Amino acid sequence: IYQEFVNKYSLSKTLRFELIPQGKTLENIKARGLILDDEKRAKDYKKAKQIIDKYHQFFIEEILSSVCISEDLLQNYSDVYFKLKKSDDDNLQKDFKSAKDTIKKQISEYIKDSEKFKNLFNQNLIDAKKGQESDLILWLKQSKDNGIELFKANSDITDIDEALEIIKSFKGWTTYFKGFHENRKNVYSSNDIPTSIIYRIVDDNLPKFLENKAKYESLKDKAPEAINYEQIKKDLAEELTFDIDYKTSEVNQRVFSLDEVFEIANFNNYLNQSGITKFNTIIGGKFVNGENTKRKGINEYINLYSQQINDKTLKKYKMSVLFKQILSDTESKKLEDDSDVVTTMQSFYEQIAAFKTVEEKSIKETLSLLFDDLKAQKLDLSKIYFKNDKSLTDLSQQVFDDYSVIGTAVLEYITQQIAPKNLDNPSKKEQELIAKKTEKAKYLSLETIKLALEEFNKHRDIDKQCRFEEILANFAAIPMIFDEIAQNKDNLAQISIKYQNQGKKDLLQASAEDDVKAIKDLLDQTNNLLHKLKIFHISQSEDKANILDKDEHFYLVFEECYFELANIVPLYNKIRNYITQKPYSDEKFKLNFENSTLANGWDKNKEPDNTAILFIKDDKYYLGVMNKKNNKIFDDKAIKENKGEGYKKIVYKLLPGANKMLPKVFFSAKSIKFYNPSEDILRIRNHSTHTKNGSPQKGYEKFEFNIEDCRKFIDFYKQSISKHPEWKDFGFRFSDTQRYNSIDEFYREVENQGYKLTFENISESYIDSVVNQGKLYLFQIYNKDFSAYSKGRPNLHTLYWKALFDERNLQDVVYKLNGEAELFYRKQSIPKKITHPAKEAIANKNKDNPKKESVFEYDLIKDKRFTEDKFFFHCPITINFKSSGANKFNDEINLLLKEKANDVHILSIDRGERHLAYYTLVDGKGNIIKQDTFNIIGNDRMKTNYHDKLAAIEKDRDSARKDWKKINNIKEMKEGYLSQVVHEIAKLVIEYNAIVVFQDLNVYQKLEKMLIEKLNYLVFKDNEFDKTGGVLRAYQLTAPFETFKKMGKQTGIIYYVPAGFTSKICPVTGFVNQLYPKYESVSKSQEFFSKFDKICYNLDKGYFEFSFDYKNFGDKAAKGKWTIASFGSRLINFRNSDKNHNWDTREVYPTKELEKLLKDYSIEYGHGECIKAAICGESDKKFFAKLTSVLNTILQMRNSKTGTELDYLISPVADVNGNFFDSRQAPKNMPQDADANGAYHIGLKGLMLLGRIKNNQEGKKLNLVIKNEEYFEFVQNRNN
RNA sequence: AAUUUCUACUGUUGUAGAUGAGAAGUCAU
DNA sequence: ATGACTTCTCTAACGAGCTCG
DNA sequence: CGAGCTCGTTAGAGAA
């Protein structure tokens, strides 16, 4: 079991906390403006990062414009490509990587050797050196102040006349960008890492250009057609100036042909963005800004040719568009603003004030006066067709308001005579309902609606039934909806002036819902005034035969004015989720306090550069931000003075990067003479002889690794550390150098043990003294458990943080504090209101609660997370720091489970909406142990039930459209359930020696994200400290998360299984709905019954049978005889989705429906032998198309829906001794409810994975996939 | 409805469970 | 226009530009 | 101006 499976690999968390200002640190900071002047160095940090980045683009458009020509090796890459992708052999794949390597270094050589490359990625870009300012103003102040590249119109920054101020503000702050330029240096990286522009061109466009000239050589096999070199390129000449040709050379401004493309050696023209925007007009085709028509390209002419010629497979020869170059800008050539929310409403009032109709009038003044003529059929009163989806119901709800009133009479005129049942396929047909009938996607007109209502008027009671003229008064005041939306514009004069702030947010909080009455109801006149006039517009819905017989009289203003007044259905999608956004309206911006390199590390020697140390005061943790002006105020001088009592002080001591550090002191100019490196050793470090991949010192030669030419370099290191002034404090204990093997085994142990944390007591009166002027900023690290009113269980981001500083920890550090983190200042989101006030009754909101009120002495403000300008401190850690890893992990536990066999259980899952899951803890030998749901959860005493809260909000899909004003915020709701599930999954695994499985989904998937990310480190809040699950020694069960798409057939102990074919199955044998009868033609249903062994009524037992060996079938020939029956009282389906039709499960019995047939056809059964031949002897539409819904029911087992009335699973087979399985007559070790037998055999799928691992051998590839001829094979031989 | 955040909260100035942040860029049921 | 996929960092110290002098 | 002088480079391993 999992008794040694702790401390396996290392991680990285990010514990967050909150900083409470102590003393009057809040009075020091708010005095001058030390955070007032912040958000001008966390806002201008990103304003400058995207004015530094277009010059980081303008560079790439002049180091890929006319340069970087990797000629004729493209041919050398074309050779290794087509043969390897067609024949995956070993020898070319080596040559493939050789071709892959060589293009990059050829390209990257000129890339890394520019005029502007070197002085871009350090101090020499922004501000470098006295006398000038370096390369960043060399483009703006020099190149683009004289010349004009005005992208300040196309930006957030106003102009360039002011933009100098954003540039010069970082003077000296140019060590602060040192993570931002730590990913630009993977843009130019010629390594196998996919952010690069060199992985963009070599391996991500070049095998997408070899598959381009594997088709253009096959294009001009019959492609002479009307392609723009034949007809027109006057437009595409300024657009295709084509400055260079790179097979030999070119004239400056010559226009090329359709042959420069697809050359193997012209791939050195397809590098940058401006050059793929000229590759994707030729295949793209673009516009002219002058009221013109689209001027096409190549794949917009094959659109005009594979419809001319009838070659349907000629669309295999379209040219795939290339990708985008990394980091390239794009050219042109919902919201949050409380002004645009008041301006788009003003634009909806203004857009109706100038809408152009046909007669120089409005769209409402055109469709309204025509209704007076169209009501008398003055327009085309016979072919007024709309998109036939809901206008049959909406017109039935237009003036009559009926679901079965007017729109249910067109069935006797539309789609009932594709094949009449009189001598033309009356019973013998191939089910010609798609071939002989195509009346599904036809449109219905007003004359066809009037003619549909003629049979309903002929079926009407009164003789004054509905004609096409009398019911025409229903669309009279539809043009009057513009008069009512005009009533929502007088109050906007007190609304638009009441929206004079840029970032207003007058409704996004929790208090201003009544202010939206001027917008959630004045936008209602366009909510329903256009929502009722949708019958006068022709939609786009057809089953391949859409004609509809459209008219032209009223349809001219219908598509125009219905489109001219579409400022509501677009405008009401503009207040669509602006209202339902909960307050986390944060900014979370960085604090500096003058220190760019703030808090990067805690180690003592660098402390006036970081200017932050922590303070323990007997488990009340504080943060001290030393002010930069006086940052020496915690040296050893004051520690020798103020050795008193009060705040303990953190002494941190650190050796980071033993690759980068043990050659940083020991071979460097200021201090090499103190160390005195020997003769043979100084040979090694130059040429990197001690490494296997290490970079040698420049101007030398990478020699070979050697055995003693590395171990001596440890023998240098084992003595040279003890000579250091500070690093002899640690007292390392290395092993013998016979036992080392490389330098990783040494650089790990100088980074394992290179961490010690100690404590120096400080007199409390001194700290109180220094805070009062401003010479220290002290802040308390704070969450739930760092307030005084806790009782019980602390957060798992407060069992770690309280165990960094443990004296059981710092024996052998498994929680290494880390650095680099920042301080964040969220402003006030929620303005303070209580709304659950003091000492009064407030109602509960649970249902299984033995209480119904609450008293609440103290107030509860709506959001005290967000009424307070809380500070925010981050804090990385490193769980299992001394024991890193994360390799060979998925193959470890298989060797673990083998030795500890016969002792392991299985978890499970299913999904649904009728449940949310249903776990099932299964044994290893059949008879299962436990089984429950994930609806009863939180089972200590409170028992909340998430299962019903989803359907509680699914019923309320209206008010975001109706009064345009709903608050549910369901999008984090449902994911928020998924968190609570994890622990109850997590508890069972250790407690019952279990393994876990899941479903696949290659948001029901996101719960598998959250057990790979959360069996990284599994520590129980109730478990004892430094015991097998405690905060130091806890469970690492997953190797961590990379992607969904390589989640494996294992991701730890979380084995997987294939989806589907669980939710239908009898348990004790395992037969599935594998037939699929649907009665296409007549005697193919006789082909069903003719293959049986015998079909008899078991008169000795009181039910029918259908005995069949499955051999005589061919869709999926799962063998074995099958003996289904009629004894269960199986339920028919509801035939659901019907508001007035048969949507109820009228239960049809099996045994009392074949004696309906025995009465209809008197084929007896008293002899007790084969009765197959006579039942085959009948052929009728009545005999078989009614036998469908019976034979859809003798088998079907999931049932009983619309009510969840213990929907239940009924066995046909009666395996060994004649008893069935009804899943409510079912014992506890068998499935029990709706989605229960789905999650059972998944475990029996899971036991099959264990069946291979149990008899596993030394085969390093282990077969963890399940064949359908195994899952249907294993479970049918369990008892035997 | 109170939280480092987020979900449900009465589990009472909080309770139970999980909680990785910052900058980037790429891609698409 | 949200989800998904690969990669970065999670540092103290030295050697230099540094105004002092 | 040689002590020192205060932020920007700089050492650059090992799985697979």
mmCIF file of C-alpha atoms in Angstrom, chain A residues 83-249:
data_model
loop_
_atom_site.group_PDB
_atom_site.id
_atom_site.type_symbol
_atom_site.label_atom_id
_atom_site.label_comp_id
_atom_site.label_asym_id
_atom_site.label_seq_id
_atom_site.Cartn_x
_atom_site.Cartn_y
_atom_site.Cartn_z
ATOM 1 C CA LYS A 83 10.100 9.433 -48.213
ATOM 2 C CA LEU A 84 10.023 9.504 -44.405
ATOM 3 C CA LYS A 85 6.339 10.417 -44.164
ATOM 4 C CA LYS A 86 5.515 7.624 -46.631
ATOM 5 C CA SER A 87 8.046 5.084 -45.333
ATOM 6 C CA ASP A 88 8.853 5.709 -41.664
ATOM 7 C CA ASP A 89 12.344 4.219 -41.701
ATOM 8 C CA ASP A 90 15.249 4.687 -39.302
ATOM 9 C CA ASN A 91 18.001 5.889 -41.615
ATOM 10 C CA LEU A 92 16.176 8.826 -43.178
ATOM 11 C CA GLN A 93 14.854 10.019 -39.811
ATOM 12 C CA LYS A 94 18.453 10.643 -38.730
ATOM 13 C CA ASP A 95 19.034 12.516 -42.001
ATOM 14 C CA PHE A 96 15.708 14.249 -41.404
ATOM 15 C CA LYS A 97 16.984 15.732 -38.141
ATOM 16 C CA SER A 98 20.258 16.569 -39.885
ATOM 17 C CA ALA A 99 18.253 18.486 -42.454
ATOM 18 C CA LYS A 100 16.142 19.869 -39.610
ATOM 19 C CA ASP A 101 19.216 21.064 -37.697
ATOM 20 C CA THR A 102 21.025 22.628 -40.594
ATOM 21 C CA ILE A 103 18.348 25.019 -41.871
ATOM 22 C CA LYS A 104 18.004 26.595 -38.435
ATOM 23 C CA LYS A 105 21.673 27.417 -37.784
ATOM 24 C CA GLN A 106 21.930 28.736 -41.329
ATOM 25 C CA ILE A 107 18.926 30.969 -40.666
ATOM 26 C CA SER A 108 19.753 31.843 -37.054
ATOM 27 C CA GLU A 109 23.305 32.900 -37.926
ATOM 28 C CA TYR A 110 22.274 36.125 -39.641
ATOM 29 C CA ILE A 111 19.479 36.513 -37.089
ATOM 30 C CA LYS A 112 21.922 36.674 -34.183
ATOM 31 C CA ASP A 113 24.318 39.016 -36.002
ATOM 32 C CA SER A 114 22.487 42.254 -36.632
ATOM 33 C CA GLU A 115 23.182 45.929 -36.180
ATOM 34 C CA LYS A 116 20.214 46.086 -33.804
ATOM 35 C CA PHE A 117 20.166 42.601 -32.288
ATOM 36 C CA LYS A 118 22.698 42.824 -29.474
ATOM 37 C CA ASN A 119 21.673 46.204 -28.066
ATOM 38 C CA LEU A 120 18.011 45.191 -27.735
ATOM 39 C CA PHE A 121 17.845 42.663 -24.900
ATOM 40 C CA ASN A 122 19.668 44.447 -22.083
ATOM 41 C CA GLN A 123 20.307 47.954 -20.727
ATOM 42 C CA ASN A 124 21.438 48.984 -24.225
ATOM 43 C CA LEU A 125 17.862 49.247 -25.508
ATOM 44 C CA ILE A 126 15.890 51.561 -23.221
ATOM 45 C CA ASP A 127 18.574 53.674 -21.531
ATOM 46 C CA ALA A 128 22.209 52.607 -21.338
ATOM 47 C CA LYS A 129 24.960 55.165 -21.122
ATOM 48 C CA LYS A 130 25.677 58.861 -20.711
ATOM 49 C CA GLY A 131 25.678 61.050 -23.807
ATOM 50 C CA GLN A 132 22.888 59.484 -25.826
ATOM 51 C CA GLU A 133 19.918 57.291 -25.155
ATOM 52 C CA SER A 134 20.246 53.831 -26.645
ATOM 53 C CA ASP A 135 18.577 51.825 -29.385
ATOM 54 C CA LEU A 136 14.924 52.259 -28.470
ATOM 55 C CA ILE A 137 14.911 55.999 -29.122
ATOM 56 C CA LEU A 138 17.173 55.268 -32.096
ATOM 57 C CA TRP A 139 13.981 54.192 -33.855
ATOM 58 C CA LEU A 140 11.387 56.514 -32.358
ATOM 59 C CA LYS A 141 13.319 59.712 -31.715
ATOM 60 C CA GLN A 142 15.665 59.127 -34.650
ATOM 61 C CA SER A 143 14.106 56.921 -37.316
ATOM 62 C CA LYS A 144 10.416 57.634 -36.703
ATOM 63 C CA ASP A 145 10.454 61.251 -35.599
ATOM 64 C CA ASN A 146 11.955 62.412 -38.896
ATOM 65 C CA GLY A 147 10.052 59.831 -40.884
ATOM 66 C CA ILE A 148 6.440 59.166 -39.951
ATOM 67 C CA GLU A 149 5.269 55.652 -39.106
ATOM 68 C CA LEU A 150 2.106 56.797 -37.344
ATOM 69 C CA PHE A 151 0.840 53.720 -35.556
ATOM 70 C CA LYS A 152 -0.095 55.905 -32.593
ATOM 71 C CA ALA A 153 -3.451 56.278 -34.298
ATOM 72 C CA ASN A 154 -3.518 52.467 -34.349
ATOM 73 C CA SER A 155 -2.709 52.108 -30.644
ATOM 74 C CA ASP A 156 -3.566 53.108 -27.090
ATOM 75 C CA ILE A 157 -0.745 55.640 -26.805
ATOM 76 C CA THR A 158 -1.898 59.057 -28.001
ATOM 77 C CA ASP A 159 0.972 60.287 -30.185
ATOM 78 C CA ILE A 160 4.763 60.169 -30.249
ATOM 79 C CA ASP A 161 5.138 63.795 -29.094
ATOM 80 C CA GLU A 162 4.230 62.670 -25.577
ATOM 81 C CA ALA A 163 5.399 59.023 -25.849
ATOM 82 C CA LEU A 164 8.996 59.972 -24.969
ATOM 83 C CA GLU A 165 7.876 60.270 -21.337
ATOM 84 C CA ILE A 166 6.817 56.608 -21.176
ATOM 85 C CA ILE A 167 10.242 55.648 -22.508
ATOM 86 C CA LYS A 168 12.464 57.672 -20.190
ATOM 87 C CA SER A 169 10.530 56.720 -17.040
ATOM 88 C CA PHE A 170 12.364 53.398 -16.628
ATOM 89 C CA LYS A 171 15.750 55.082 -16.205
ATOM 90 C CA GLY A 172 17.561 52.611 -14.007
ATOM 91 C CA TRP A 173 14.484 50.366 -14.005
ATOM 92 C CA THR A 174 15.967 48.194 -16.728
ATOM 93 C CA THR A 175 16.624 45.229 -14.484
ATOM 94 C CA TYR A 176 12.889 45.067 -13.873
ATOM 95 C CA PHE A 177 11.999 43.721 -17.298
ATOM 96 C CA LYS A 178 14.036 40.548 -16.587
ATOM 97 C CA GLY A 179 11.144 38.131 -16.963
ATOM 98 C CA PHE A 180 9.668 39.921 -19.972
ATOM 99 C CA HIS A 181 12.865 39.475 -21.914
ATOM 100 C CA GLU A 182 13.046 35.888 -20.647
ATOM 101 C CA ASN A 183 10.518 34.858 -23.270
ATOM 102 C CA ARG A 184 11.659 37.079 -26.105
ATOM 103 C CA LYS A 185 14.816 34.974 -25.748
ATOM 104 C CA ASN A 186 12.734 31.927 -26.656
ATOM 105 C CA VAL A 187 11.346 33.725 -29.720
ATOM 106 C CA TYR A 188 14.813 33.708 -31.310
ATOM 107 C CA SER A 189 15.809 30.367 -29.807
ATOM 108 C CA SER A 190 16.958 27.791 -32.343
ATOM 109 C CA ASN A 191 16.035 24.943 -30.014
ATOM 110 C CA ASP A 192 13.222 22.368 -30.230
ATOM 111 C CA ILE A 193 10.837 24.728 -28.436
ATOM 112 C CA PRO A 194 7.674 25.915 -30.163
ATOM 113 C CA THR A 195 7.433 29.607 -29.363
ATOM 114 C CA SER A 196 10.293 30.277 -31.772
ATOM 115 C CA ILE A 197 10.226 31.949 -35.162
ATOM 116 C CA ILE A 198 12.744 29.275 -36.157
ATOM 117 C CA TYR A 199 10.422 26.473 -35.170
ATOM 118 C CA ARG A 200 7.832 28.513 -37.071
ATOM 119 C CA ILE A 201 9.725 28.469 -40.377
ATOM 120 C CA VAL A 202 11.719 25.220 -40.287
ATOM 121 C CA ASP A 203 9.270 22.686 -38.889
ATOM 122 C CA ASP A 204 5.914 24.495 -39.089
ATOM 123 C CA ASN A 205 5.809 26.011 -42.573
ATOM 124 C CA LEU A 206 8.330 23.984 -44.529
ATOM 125 C CA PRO A 207 6.448 20.666 -44.198
ATOM 126 C CA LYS A 208 3.429 22.842 -44.965
ATOM 127 C CA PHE A 209 5.109 23.952 -48.194
ATOM 128 C CA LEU A 210 6.355 20.562 -49.288
ATOM 129 C CA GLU A 211 2.725 19.496 -49.097
ATOM 130 C CA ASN A 212 2.129 22.630 -51.167
ATOM 131 C CA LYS A 213 4.453 21.564 -53.996
ATOM 132 C CA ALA A 214 3.169 18.029 -53.665
ATOM 133 C CA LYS A 215 -0.040 19.526 -55.108
ATOM 134 C CA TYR A 216 0.950 22.361 -57.480
ATOM 135 C CA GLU A 217 2.886 19.851 -59.566
ATOM 136 C CA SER A 218 -0.446 18.014 -59.666
ATOM 137 C CA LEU A 219 -2.429 21.256 -60.109
ATOM 138 C CA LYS A 220 -1.313 21.985 -63.675
ATOM 139 C CA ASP A 221 -2.574 18.570 -64.639
ATOM 140 C CA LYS A 222 -5.686 20.283 -66.139
ATOM 141 C CA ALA A 223 -5.778 23.674 -64.477
ATOM 142 C CA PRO A 224 -5.788 26.213 -67.344
ATOM 143 C CA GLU A 225 -8.849 28.020 -66.064
ATOM 144 C CA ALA A 226 -9.760 31.670 -65.454
ATOM 145 C CA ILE A 227 -6.969 32.491 -63.015
ATOM 146 C CA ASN A 228 -5.901 36.120 -62.498
ATOM 147 C CA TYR A 229 -2.789 35.916 -64.689
ATOM 148 C CA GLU A 230 -5.277 35.434 -67.526
ATOM 149 C CA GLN A 231 -7.880 38.109 -66.752
ATOM 150 C CA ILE A 232 -6.881 40.945 -64.402
ATOM 151 C CA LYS A 233 -3.948 42.084 -62.307
ATOM 152 C CA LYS A 234 -4.245 45.880 -62.622
ATOM 153 C CA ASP A 235 -5.608 45.899 -59.074
ATOM 154 C CA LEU A 236 -3.005 43.424 -57.793
ATOM 155 C CA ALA A 237 0.089 45.361 -58.923
ATOM 156 C CA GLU A 238 0.434 48.070 -56.300
ATOM 157 C CA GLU A 239 -0.845 45.256 -54.100
ATOM 158 C CA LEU A 240 1.832 42.888 -55.500
ATOM 159 C CA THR A 241 4.868 45.127 -56.117
ATOM 160 C CA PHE A 242 7.146 42.081 -55.492
ATOM 161 C CA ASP A 243 10.426 43.812 -54.718
ATOM 162 C CA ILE A 244 12.690 40.739 -54.919
ATOM 163 C CA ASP A 245 13.053 37.289 -56.460
ATOM 164 C CA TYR A 246 15.329 34.835 -54.683
ATOM 165 C CA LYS A 247 16.286 32.214 -57.133
ATOM 166 C CA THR A 248 18.806 34.560 -58.753
ATOM 167 C CA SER A 249 17.800 38.268 -58.365
#
